[PDB]
Design a protein around this ligand. Structure first.
Ligand SMILES: CCCCCCCCOc1cccc(CSc2ccc(Br)cc2C(=O)O)c1
Ligand SMILES: [Mg+2]
Length: 284
């Protein structure tokens, strides 16, 4: 097991540690591709976590700095300020593959920005956030999961990224509340006559259900769009990408079954995951 290999494995560990779904799925990619995926995810994972370190930025800029470095001189050695195991893997990728560097910045910008989180006025702000945090990730991933990236590829991938984020939001309503965050828009809330603090104490009612389902619909629909254009992705990637999607949609029927609880994280059993993989796998 060589030296890069050792990096990609930290990267892998990190991915596997955060999201069990993504890993379940993207691990079934070919060697070349899944290792690049691992690199990217880890970089991003770091970017999100860079805040809970000292209680201040630092890092984040380092990470920005190490990235900006690779962007510039990809074939020179760098002494990375942040995490070296990761920045290495990425550099390796960056050699063999195109990288939407901008999108990393977009994501970093989004994280800088989230320090002064005020609630969203309107769904537009919400949708703008989803872009920042996930639409960006989809773009970065695009050269990895398709043979000839066209505007069209990028668009789908982004749209998938945004959807999943929306679902993860939908799943984490309680948990997010606890850390003084609410992602539903002020607008949508007033319209639906929901106060999240009140639901948290007194359990769900009909208004919450409806506001949640309003958003559940947006996701569901967007996921159907993406499924239709799955073909923009390379042949090996398609069933994998369908998998990750399916697993994530599946999260919604979970929240439903749990009666939209705000006092815990629902999950998709590993066994159900496999069941899905089988259904998809079977049709390929
Ligand atoms: C082809 C389909 C592409 C699928 C894309 C995957 C969706 C997003 O995947 C990600 C992976 C790694 C990291 C991130 C950032 S998470 C994040 C960032 C910023 C802030 Br503020 C809060 C969070 C948070 O989740 O709380 C997202
Ligand atoms: Mg979240």
């Amino acid at each position: 097991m060589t030296m890069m290999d050792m990096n990609f494995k930290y990267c892998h560990k990190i991915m596997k540690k955060h999201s069990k779904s993504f890993s379940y799925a993207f691990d079934l990619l070919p060697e070349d591709q899944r290792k690049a995926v691992w690199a990217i995810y880890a970089v991003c994972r770091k970017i999100d976590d860079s805040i809970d370190v000292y209680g201040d930025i630092q890092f984040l800029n380092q990470i920005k700095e190490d990235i900006q470095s690779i962007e510039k001189y990809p074939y020179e050695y760098h002494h990375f300020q942040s995490d070296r195991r990761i920045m290495m893997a990425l550099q390796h990728v960056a050699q063999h593959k195109n990288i939407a560097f901008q999108s990393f910045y977009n994501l970093i910008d989004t994280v800088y920005k989230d320090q002064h989180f005020t609630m969203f006025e309107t769904d537009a702000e919400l949708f703008g956030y989803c872009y920042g945090v996930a639409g960006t990730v989809g773009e970065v991933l695009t050269p990895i999961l398709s043979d000839h990236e066209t505007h069209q590829t990028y668009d789908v991938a982004r749209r998938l990224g945004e959807s999943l984020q929306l679902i993860n939001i939908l799943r984490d309503v309680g948990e997010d509340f606890e850390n003084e965050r609410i992602y539903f828009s002020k607008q949508r809330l007033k319209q639906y006559e929901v106060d999240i603090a009140e639901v948290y104490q007194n359990g769900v009612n009909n208004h919450y259900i409806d506001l949640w389902e309003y958003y559940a619909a947006i996701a569901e629909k967007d996921f159907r769009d993406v499924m239709d254009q799955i073909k923009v992705f390379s042949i090996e990637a398609q069933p994998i990408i369908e998998l990750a999607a399916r697993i994530y949609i599946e999260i919604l029927d979970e929240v439903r079954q749990a009666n939209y609880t705000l006092h815990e994280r629902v999950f998709v059993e590993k066994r159900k995951k496999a069941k899905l993989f089988h259904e998809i796998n079977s049709k390929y």
